[PDB]
Design a protein around this ligand. Structure first.
Ligand SMILES: O=c1[nH]cnc2c(CNC(CO)CO)c[nH]c12
Ligand SMILES: O=c1[nH]cnc2c(CNC(CO)CO)c[nH]c12
Ligand SMILES: O=c1[nH]cnc2c(CNC(CO)CO)c[nH]c12
Lengths: 286, 286, 286
């Protein structure tokens, strides 16, 4: 196997974007199904459908893939992904993570990734936000890693480290910003496990993930993190706990998409404000 | 990647079967290498070689794939798979699980899956039957899930739940039926872990599976379960413990296929009677 | 999916080698990035670039793949792989492990595999050698197994056992040879876990591997072991601990390739002597 994208392709996509927008972002944000609403908060907002952009992964009905939205968020030059790609849709990971390298070539230097996730930590609650300290890349252990294939030193090295993936600084500064909001629920912190889905975990699977020391489980994010780190982007991110994964057999309740979307709605505002304010803690470039 | 089968293909296969048999099954049974003998017990039995059926996964020597056998088992209209597909033979999972959706389109509403498995629970014995309460889909965590790819709502939703995979009712009713048989060994119950094989586990691998809370290990079943559940079939199943997986280094004994086939032979009759009787506990349709 | 190599292809490669060298090896050695230097120690040494050999996996720049080197090591007729294939480079496992079956058809009957690995056991130190007692094939659990696909009985059976993978005899005889060297560090022994990489493990991933009972982690070897065992080769091997995997969050240190290559250099001589002497403990054929 090999990544279908040459270095030229990534360059080409970047230059097309450079040519079609006056904006020069520093921060890339990937909005997890939870918070697509964040694009309202940008100013001088400029939108591209993924479908117009050269080399972008395609959805069968082109618009459902989503949009790149350049603008200013709280004084930071941002580019946001509204709509993202998952491996459970059929995308190889070198497609799932193609935007990330586009971003880097655009001059972006930081990545913010957000997502919804099911709560593995018994103490978490629906509505909680959990900062990401670390991850467990289960698909990666098997071979499903976005870097699989020949390495291009122009992006990064053959064997990058992931022990430092999630910026220590941004994580402290984020605990700050949370006192500033004066919230009843404390800001949570922990390990995100990626699994591929798309079906939901069984009781026995949940117990396995708990025992790996994971706190939250989703089906995205980790690959984008690995590619970001590979090419030198600073990374921060968090999860919205939309549900507490079913952990025993007597319970009559089931994990479902409607209630994940619903939970997304409650924490909607909360999340925007949160990310928006965090913007200011991001070091300026140079 | 994408499933090679369109909705039309599944429909087409179903209609061909509808057209070539007067039978209308309610129950689909997948006989695990253990109990192929069960086809003797059907009445008004009608056989199709997989090789004659449109869109069916093919074996290189066509007959070795096996047969669909429609008939009546203890007053229930059944269709049985004699021969099944494993991922270790090279099949993608959308082929492994193609029959299951054919069955649903045939009007089947329940699935019975049986298999042979190695015993992880230290208290299990060769000959034991273990009802399946839950599973751990290791291949699924990595991306190997039969639903990977675009979802067709005509079958089921994007993110189906698996916490309720194994019918609670059928599992109690099955403990009933077992007293009825008056057996010396008790009916076992537990978690089936799927691994892909085809080579057998090492000592260290076994210990890993034990610590995930698995009771039995095989190389099938879970994908068919996931697809069944996805399209609304009630699911029940069990494993025949053919061997106790080697768990320490001093032992001179090895897991082998001959002794798995042999164990299949002992529990042969026992299993037939068992499944045959269980038939009566399956709710009628409507 | 299927293995791209027919039986004829393996035969063809073997006969080409049989025809181009007067040597008839008994022992195949796979030198892990650590000890490529071992080829200096052979006598009557004869080299083939992988690129000249029919059906050999290719590197894009052909020479970077490496060389087969036939010769005599301490009175044993050896063939050595200098350069090996990993799945993180993009190779399917039936390519990664193609040489192993070539070796068997060459009349080889033993395999020695060496590699570098990160230390999971808290008591291990950089420089330590760890004999391989067992392995945990994480990629194998998901479907990534070199035997996936139709089986050819000419090599081995459908479901070979791996509980006896690592020769008990060779492992005792190897503890012998180590007293003989009179070393300050004791000879270590334990379980090698394979993961696919190519990025390095996170803290949380490390803790997961520790809790599976692994002692060392690398990105090779296991597939070659599985294929060797499948066709009847005796197998022995070991790892050079080049680094201690980062296990807590306060540490400022990172796993990197430079320091893995560096560690390779320290244990260079040590390893050669070691393997060279071990040669004598290998039973003669017949
Ligand atoms: O319990 C869960 N398990 C796995 N993933 C999720 C997610 C993440 N979103 C899913 C389905 O809504 C995949 O995009 C939320 N809850 C959970
Ligand atoms: O110990 C075992 N491990 C994994 N699978 C099996 C099975 C299930 N059958 C295998 C080989 O007979 C794959 O179809 C029986 N015993 C075990
Ligand atoms: O800490 C580690 N983790 C995984 N693999 C390795 C290896 C094996 N070599 C790697 C990179 O040098 C892949 O060939 C050494 N240290 C470790």
């Amino acid at each position: 196997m090999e990544n279908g994208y040459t270095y030229e392709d990534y360059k080409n996509t970047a230059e097309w974007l450079l040519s079609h927008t006056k904006h020069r972002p520093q921060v890339a944000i990937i909005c997890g199904s939870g918070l697509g609403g964040l694009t309202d908060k940008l100013t001088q907002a400029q939108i591209f459908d993924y479908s117009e952009i050269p080399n972008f992964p395609r959805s069968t009905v082109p618009g459902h893939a989503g949009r790149l939205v350049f603008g200013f968020l709280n004084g930071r030059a941002c580019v946001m992904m509204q709509g993202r790609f998952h491996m459970y849709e059929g995308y190889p990971l070198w497609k799932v993570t193609f935007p990330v390298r586009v971003f880097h070539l655009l001059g972006v230097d930081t990545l913010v990734v957000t997502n919804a996730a099911g709560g593995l930590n018994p103490k978490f609650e629906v509505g909680d936000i959990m900062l990401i300290r670390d991850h467990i890349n289960l698909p990666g252990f098997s071979g499903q890693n976005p870097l699989r294939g020949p390495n291009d030193e122009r992006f990064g090295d053959r064997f990058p480290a992931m022990s430092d993936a999630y910026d220590r600084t941004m994580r402290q500064r984020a605990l700050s910003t949370w006192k500033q909001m004066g919230e009843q629920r404390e800001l949570q912190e922990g390990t995100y496990v990626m699994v591929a889905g798309p079906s939901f975990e069984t009781v026995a699977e949940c117990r396995v993930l708990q025992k790996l020391g994971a706190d939250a489980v989703g089906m995205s994010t980790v690959p984008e993190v690995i590619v970001a780190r590979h090419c030198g982007l600073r990374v921060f991110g968090f999860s919205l706990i939309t549900n507490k994964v079913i952990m025993d057999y007597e319970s009559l309740e089931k994990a479902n998409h409607e209630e994940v979307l619903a939970a997304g709605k409650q924490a909607a505002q909360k999340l925007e404000q949160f990310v928006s304010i965090l913007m200011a803690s991001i070091p300026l470039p140079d």
